[PDB]
Amino acid sequence: RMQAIKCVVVGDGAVGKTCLLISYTTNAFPGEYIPTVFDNYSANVMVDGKPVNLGLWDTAGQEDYDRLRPLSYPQTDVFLICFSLVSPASFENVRAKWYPEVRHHCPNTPIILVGTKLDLRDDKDTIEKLKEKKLTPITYPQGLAMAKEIGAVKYLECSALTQRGLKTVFDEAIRAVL
Amino acid sequence: SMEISPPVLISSSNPTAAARIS
Ligand SMILES: Nc1nc2c(ncn2[C@@H]2O[C@H](COP(=O)(O)OP(=O)(O)NP(=O)(O)O)[C@@H](O)[C@H]2O)c(=O)[nH]1
Ligand SMILES: [Mg+2]
């Protein structure tokens, strides 16, 4: 049977988990935000000339799905823990929620920490809106330190919108398994 | 040192993505 990888994507609502998956697998970007309960993407990649099936599992960022979400975790090979680079609350939830939940169910599964919406970090309006609430975007060093703190294999930054660093996220997930 | 190709979507439960297949 063709070699297969199950990758599960978790993180707060609105961080960009669904756009990450749509943009990576089809190069499209959806025009309207519809909250995810569960969704799936089956895609083939060539890894050193051999086909690999990527089973990508999308999950709900909302607290109301906390009891169902872990039921999708069995047989996971790698987790993507996602936070938005322009949402400090979503960053803090990596330590307060996502890392503890993933580790409770899957103590030995590799984690990639993913900073999303890279395109917004330099956006003056986004910066000013954060600044008005005494906040600042998450910097690369901050993300890196959080990755070290939670034992993540790798810290990566990307934009689903521009596709900057997007392919690298999934390539690194593959490398964490194969 | 790994050569990884872009993905080819085979299937999805997601309406937006499934529409862009094959
Ligand atoms: N500027 C920018 N906006 C993005 C990016 N990725 C997602 N967004 C926007 O952020 C919002 C939420 O994205 P989405 O992928 O639906 O988030 P989610 O993490 O899947 N949410 P949920 O857990 O509820 O399913 C949408 O308005 C989407 O267009 C990105 O790379 N850049
Ligand atoms: Mg979603």
d(CA A125, CA A93): 24
d(CA A65, CA A108): 23
Residue A174, both tokens: 């593959």
By C-alpha distance, which of A116, A37, A126, A122 is closest to A80?
A116
d(CA A132, CA B17): 37
By C-alpha distance, which of A73, A39, A80 is closest to A177?
A80
Ligand 2 (ion): residues with CB under 5 Å are A 17-18, 36
* β-pairing verdict for B8-12 and A3-11: unpaired
| Chain B residues within 8 A of A47 when measuring between CB atoms | 2-5
SS3 of residue A86 by DSSP: coil
Experimental method: X-ray
Residue A64, phi-psi category: left (phi > 0), alpha (psi -120 to 50), beta (remainder): alpha
Instruction: Write the residue in B2, B3, B10 that is nearest to A43 by C-beta.
Output: B10
Q: How many helices (DSSP H) and strands (DSSP E) are in chain B?
A: 1, 1
Instruction: Write the residue in A18, A21, A167 that is nearest to B6 by C-beta.
Output: A167
**B7 vs A170: CB contact, 8 Å cut-off?**
yes
- All domains in chain A, ordered by first residue: 3-177 (3.40.50.300)
**B17 vs A43: CB contact, 8 Å cut-off?**
no
For A74-108, b/e burial (b = at least 16 CB within 10 A) is eebbbbbbbbbbbbbebbebbeebbbebbeebbee
Phi and psi dihedrals of A47, rounded to 5? -115, 110
